[PDB]
Tab-separated table of C-alpha atoms in Angstrom:
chain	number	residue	atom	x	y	z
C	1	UNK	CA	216.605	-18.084	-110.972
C	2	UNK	CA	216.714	-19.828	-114.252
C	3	UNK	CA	213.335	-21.346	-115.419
C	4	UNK	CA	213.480	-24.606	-117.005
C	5	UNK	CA	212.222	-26.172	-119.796
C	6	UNK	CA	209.773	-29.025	-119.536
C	7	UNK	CA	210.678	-32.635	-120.720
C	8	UNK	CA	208.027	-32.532	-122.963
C	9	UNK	CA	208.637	-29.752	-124.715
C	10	UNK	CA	212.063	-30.729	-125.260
C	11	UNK	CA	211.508	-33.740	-126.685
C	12	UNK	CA	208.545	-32.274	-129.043
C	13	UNK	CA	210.972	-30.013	-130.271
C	14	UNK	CA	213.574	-32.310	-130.766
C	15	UNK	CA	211.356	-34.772	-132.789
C	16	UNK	CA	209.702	-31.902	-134.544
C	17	UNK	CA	212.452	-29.993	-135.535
C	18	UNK	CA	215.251	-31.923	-135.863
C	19	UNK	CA	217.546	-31.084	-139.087
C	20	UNK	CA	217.377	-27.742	-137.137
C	21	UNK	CA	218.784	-28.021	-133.962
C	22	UNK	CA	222.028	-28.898	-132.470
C	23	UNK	CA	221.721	-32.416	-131.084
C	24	UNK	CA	221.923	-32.356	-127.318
C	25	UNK	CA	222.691	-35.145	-124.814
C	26	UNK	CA	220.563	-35.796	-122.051
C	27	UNK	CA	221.998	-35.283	-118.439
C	28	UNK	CA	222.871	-38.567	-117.876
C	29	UNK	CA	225.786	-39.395	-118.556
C	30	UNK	CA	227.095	-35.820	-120.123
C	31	UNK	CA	230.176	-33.697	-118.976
C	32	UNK	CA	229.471	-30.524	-120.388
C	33	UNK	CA	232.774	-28.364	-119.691
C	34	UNK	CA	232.938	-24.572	-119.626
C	35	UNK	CA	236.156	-22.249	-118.882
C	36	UNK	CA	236.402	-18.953	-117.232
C	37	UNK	CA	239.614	-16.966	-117.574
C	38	UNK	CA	239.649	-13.824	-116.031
C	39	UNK	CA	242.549	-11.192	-115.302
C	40	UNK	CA	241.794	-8.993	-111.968
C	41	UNK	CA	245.214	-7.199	-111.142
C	42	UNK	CA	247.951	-6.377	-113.467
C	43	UNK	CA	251.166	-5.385	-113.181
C	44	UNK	CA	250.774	-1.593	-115.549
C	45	UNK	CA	246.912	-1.550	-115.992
C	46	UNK	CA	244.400	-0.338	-113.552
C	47	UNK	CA	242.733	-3.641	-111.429
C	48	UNK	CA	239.283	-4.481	-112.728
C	49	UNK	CA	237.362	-3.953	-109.891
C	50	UNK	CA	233.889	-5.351	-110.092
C	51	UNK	CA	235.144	-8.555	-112.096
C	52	UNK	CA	234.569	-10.756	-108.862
C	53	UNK	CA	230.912	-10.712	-109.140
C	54	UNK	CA	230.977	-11.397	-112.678
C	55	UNK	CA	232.751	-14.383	-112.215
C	56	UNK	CA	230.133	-15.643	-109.800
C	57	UNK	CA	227.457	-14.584	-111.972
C	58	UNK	CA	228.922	-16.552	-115.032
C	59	UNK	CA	229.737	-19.485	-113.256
C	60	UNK	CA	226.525	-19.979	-111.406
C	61	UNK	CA	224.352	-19.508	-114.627
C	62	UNK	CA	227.050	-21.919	-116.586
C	63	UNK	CA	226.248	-24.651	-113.401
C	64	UNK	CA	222.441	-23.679	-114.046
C	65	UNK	CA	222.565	-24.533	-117.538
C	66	UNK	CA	224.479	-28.009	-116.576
C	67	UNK	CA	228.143	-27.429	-117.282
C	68	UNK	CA	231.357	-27.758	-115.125
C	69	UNK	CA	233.232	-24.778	-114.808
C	70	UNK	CA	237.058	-24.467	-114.660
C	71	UNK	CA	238.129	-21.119	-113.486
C	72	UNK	CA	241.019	-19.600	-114.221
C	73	UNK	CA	242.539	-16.265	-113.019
C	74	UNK	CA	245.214	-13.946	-113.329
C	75	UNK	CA	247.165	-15.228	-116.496
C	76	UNK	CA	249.382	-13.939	-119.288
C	77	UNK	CA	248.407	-14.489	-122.628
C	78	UNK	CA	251.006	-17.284	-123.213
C	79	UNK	CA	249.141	-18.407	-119.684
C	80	UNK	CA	245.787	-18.200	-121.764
C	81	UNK	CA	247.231	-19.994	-124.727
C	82	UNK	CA	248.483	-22.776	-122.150
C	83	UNK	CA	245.126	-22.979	-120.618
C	84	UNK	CA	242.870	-23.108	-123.372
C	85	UNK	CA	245.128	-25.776	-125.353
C	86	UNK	CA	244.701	-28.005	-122.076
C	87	UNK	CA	240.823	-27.232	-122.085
C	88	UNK	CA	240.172	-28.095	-125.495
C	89	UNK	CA	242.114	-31.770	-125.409
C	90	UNK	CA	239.510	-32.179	-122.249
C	91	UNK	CA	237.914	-35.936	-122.816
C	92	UNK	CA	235.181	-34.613	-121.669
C	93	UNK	CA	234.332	-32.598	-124.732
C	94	UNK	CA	233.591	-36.329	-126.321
C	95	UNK	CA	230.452	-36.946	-124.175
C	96	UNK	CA	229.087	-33.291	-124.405
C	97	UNK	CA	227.382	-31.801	-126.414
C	98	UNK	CA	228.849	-27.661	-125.968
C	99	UNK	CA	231.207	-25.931	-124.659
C	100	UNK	CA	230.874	-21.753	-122.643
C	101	UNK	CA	234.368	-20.273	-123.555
C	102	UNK	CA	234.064	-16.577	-120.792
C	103	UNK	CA	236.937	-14.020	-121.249
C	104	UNK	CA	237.525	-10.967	-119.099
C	105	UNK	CA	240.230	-8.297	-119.583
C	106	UNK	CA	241.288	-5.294	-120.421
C	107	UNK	CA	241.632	-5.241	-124.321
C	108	UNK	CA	243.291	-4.212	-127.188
C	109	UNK	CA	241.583	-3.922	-131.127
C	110	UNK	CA	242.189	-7.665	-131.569
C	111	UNK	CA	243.183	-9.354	-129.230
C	112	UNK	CA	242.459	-9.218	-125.026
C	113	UNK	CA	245.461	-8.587	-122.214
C	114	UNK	CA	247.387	-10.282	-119.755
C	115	UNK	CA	248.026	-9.434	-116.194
C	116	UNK	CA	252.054	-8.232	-117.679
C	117	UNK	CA	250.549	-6.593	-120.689
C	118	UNK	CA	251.590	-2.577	-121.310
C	119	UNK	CA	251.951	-0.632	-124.606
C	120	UNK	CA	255.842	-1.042	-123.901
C	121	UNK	CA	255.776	-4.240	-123.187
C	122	UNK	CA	252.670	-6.208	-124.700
C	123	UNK	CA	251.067	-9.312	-123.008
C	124	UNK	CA	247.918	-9.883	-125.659
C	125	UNK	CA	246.417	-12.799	-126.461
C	126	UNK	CA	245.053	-12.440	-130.709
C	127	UNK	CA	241.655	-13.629	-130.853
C	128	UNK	CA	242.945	-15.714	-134.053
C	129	UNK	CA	244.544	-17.550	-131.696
C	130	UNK	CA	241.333	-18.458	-129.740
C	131	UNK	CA	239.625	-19.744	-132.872
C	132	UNK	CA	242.706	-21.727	-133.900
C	133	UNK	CA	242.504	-23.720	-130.950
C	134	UNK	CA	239.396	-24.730	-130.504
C	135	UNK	CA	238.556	-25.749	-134.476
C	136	UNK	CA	237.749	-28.785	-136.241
C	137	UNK	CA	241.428	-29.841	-136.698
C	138	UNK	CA	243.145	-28.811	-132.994
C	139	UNK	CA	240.271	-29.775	-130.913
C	140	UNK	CA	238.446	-33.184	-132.223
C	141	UNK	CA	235.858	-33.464	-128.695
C	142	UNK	CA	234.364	-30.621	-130.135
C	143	UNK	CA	233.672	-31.037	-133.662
C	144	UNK	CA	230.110	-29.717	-135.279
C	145	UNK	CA	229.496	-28.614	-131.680
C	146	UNK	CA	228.438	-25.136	-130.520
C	147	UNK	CA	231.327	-23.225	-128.915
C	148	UNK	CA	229.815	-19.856	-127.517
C	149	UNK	CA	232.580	-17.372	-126.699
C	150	UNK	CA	231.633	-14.456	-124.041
C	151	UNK	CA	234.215	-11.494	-124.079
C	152	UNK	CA	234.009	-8.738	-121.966
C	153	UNK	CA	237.447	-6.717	-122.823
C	154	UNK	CA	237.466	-3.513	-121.384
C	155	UNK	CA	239.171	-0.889	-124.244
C	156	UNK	CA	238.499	-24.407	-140.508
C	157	UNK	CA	235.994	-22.746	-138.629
C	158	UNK	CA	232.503	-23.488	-137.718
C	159	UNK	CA	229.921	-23.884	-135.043
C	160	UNK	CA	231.045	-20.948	-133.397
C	161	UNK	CA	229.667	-17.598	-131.916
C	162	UNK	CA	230.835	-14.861	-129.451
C	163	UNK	CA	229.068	-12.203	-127.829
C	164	UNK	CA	231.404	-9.238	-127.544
C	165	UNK	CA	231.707	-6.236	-124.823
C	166	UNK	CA	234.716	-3.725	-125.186
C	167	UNK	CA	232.691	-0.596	-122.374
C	168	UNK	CA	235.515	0.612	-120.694
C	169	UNK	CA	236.120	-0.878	-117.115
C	170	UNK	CA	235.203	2.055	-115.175
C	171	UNK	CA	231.925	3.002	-117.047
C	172	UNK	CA	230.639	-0.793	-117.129
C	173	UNK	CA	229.387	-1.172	-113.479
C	174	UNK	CA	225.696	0.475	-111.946
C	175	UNK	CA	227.544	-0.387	-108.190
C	176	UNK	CA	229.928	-1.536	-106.131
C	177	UNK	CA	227.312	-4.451	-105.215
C	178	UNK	CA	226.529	-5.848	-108.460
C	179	UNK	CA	228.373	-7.284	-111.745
C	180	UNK	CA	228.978	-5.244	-115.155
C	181	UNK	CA	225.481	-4.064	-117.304
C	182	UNK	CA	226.563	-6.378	-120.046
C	183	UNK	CA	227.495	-9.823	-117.425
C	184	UNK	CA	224.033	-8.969	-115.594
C	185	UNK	CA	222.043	-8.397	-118.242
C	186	UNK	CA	223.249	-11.800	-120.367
C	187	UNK	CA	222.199	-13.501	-116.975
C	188	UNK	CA	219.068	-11.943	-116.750
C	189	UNK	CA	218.325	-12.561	-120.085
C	190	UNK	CA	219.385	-16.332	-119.971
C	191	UNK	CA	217.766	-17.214	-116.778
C	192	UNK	CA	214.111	-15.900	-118.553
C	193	UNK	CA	214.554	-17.035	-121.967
C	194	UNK	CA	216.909	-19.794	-122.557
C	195	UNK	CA	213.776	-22.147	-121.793
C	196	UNK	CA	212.138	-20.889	-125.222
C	197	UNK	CA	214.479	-19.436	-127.092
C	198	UNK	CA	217.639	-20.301	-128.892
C	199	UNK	CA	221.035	-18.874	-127.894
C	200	UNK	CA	220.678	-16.292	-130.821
C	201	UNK	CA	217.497	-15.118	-129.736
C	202	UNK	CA	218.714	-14.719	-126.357
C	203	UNK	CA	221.528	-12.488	-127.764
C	204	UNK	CA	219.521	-10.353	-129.687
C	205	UNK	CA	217.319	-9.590	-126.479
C	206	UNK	CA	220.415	-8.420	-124.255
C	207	UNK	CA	221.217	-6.261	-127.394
C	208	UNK	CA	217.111	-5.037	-127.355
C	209	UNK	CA	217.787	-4.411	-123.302
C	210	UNK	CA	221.000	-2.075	-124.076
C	211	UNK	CA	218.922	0.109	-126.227
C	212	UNK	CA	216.008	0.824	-124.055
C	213	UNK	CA	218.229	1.343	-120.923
C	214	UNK	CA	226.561	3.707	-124.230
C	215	UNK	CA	228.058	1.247	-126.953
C	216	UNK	CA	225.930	-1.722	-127.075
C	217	UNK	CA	227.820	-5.651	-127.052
C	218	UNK	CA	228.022	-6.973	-130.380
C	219	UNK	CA	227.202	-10.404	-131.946
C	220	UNK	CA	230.511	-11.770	-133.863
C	221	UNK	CA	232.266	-14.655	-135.617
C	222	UNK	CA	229.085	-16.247	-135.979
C	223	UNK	CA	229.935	-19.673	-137.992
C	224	UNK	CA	226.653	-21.819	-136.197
C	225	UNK	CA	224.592	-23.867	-138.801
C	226	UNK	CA	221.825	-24.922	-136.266
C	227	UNK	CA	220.289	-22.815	-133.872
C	228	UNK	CA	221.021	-23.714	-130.374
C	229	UNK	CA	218.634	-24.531	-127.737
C	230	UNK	CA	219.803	-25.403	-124.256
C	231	UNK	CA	217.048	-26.955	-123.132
C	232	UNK	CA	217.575	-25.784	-119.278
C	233	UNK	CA	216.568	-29.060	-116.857
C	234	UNK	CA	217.357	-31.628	-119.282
């Protein structure tokens, strides 16, 4: 389970190292908002077995770390364009203080698939598009405020980051009983570290774990100007 951070030590950082640090709302009164798409079964690609548990695993750590998770499945990518332009004009975003954006697919080189998607006839959503949508301009609840993007596609800007996994699908799970290496490793590493370290730091570590244990998830689009503490428990 996730260990949490003390109330203490939350505020001492926050009044010690302020300029530093996104500034995050206490959990009264916040709505923090998170959105899982996820494609399972498509109608000309293989079905991503497996992808059930990582949706559990996501979710439950996203609940963990105090956000309410919309879950969305099986979608084209004009689907996922619908979807994420209804999550980002969320009220909610205005009394929160972050946003979890989790995407799992199969993928192309830029951009990740819908459930209709085939070389014939293409169903891909551009990562561009992503960005475009949640920015300063298009999405005003979540200006200057971290939006962490976590791919797993199988193959103005700022205050954003994604954490990027492109193993194929059928080389990315150790069972048929757990989630993928790069989903249970990201939870592992979150549940032990996000009390003391910052969401780079925790990235960095499930990069350290892929090496000591195949391509390796990457760290990308990273526009943050603070580093990011969650502060789990508060």
């Amino acid at each position: 389970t996730l260990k949490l951070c003390s109330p203490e030590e939350f505020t001492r950082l926050c009044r010690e190292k302020t300029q530093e640090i996104y500034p995050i709302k206490e959990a009264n009164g916040r709505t923090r908002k998170a959105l899982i798409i996820c494609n399972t079964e498509f109608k000309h690609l293989s079905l991503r077995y497996g992808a059930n548990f990582d949706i559990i695993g996501m979710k439950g750590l996203l609940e963990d770390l105090g956000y309410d998770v919309v879950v969305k499945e099986e979608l084209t990518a004009e689907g996922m364009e619908s979807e994420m332009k209804d999550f980002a004009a969320l009220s909610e975003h205005q009394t929160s203080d972050s946003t979890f954006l989790v995407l799992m697919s199969h993928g192309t080189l830029h951009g990740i698939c819908g459930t209709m998607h085939s070389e014939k006839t293409p169903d891909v959503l551009q990562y561009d598009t992503i960005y475009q949508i949640f920015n300063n301009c298009h999405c005003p609840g979540l200006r200057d405020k971290p939006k962490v993007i976590i791919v797993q596609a199988a193959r103005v800007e700022k205050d954003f980051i994604a954490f990027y996994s492109t193993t194929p699908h059928h080389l990315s799970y150790r069972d048929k009983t757990g989630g993928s290496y790069f989903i249970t490793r990201l939870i592992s590493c979150f549940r032990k570290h996000a009390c003391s370290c910052h969401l780079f730091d925790i990235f960095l570590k499930v990069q350290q774990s892929f090496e000591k244990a195949s391509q390796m998830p990457t760290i990308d689009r990273a526009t943050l100007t603070r580093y990011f503490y969650l502060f789990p428990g508060n």
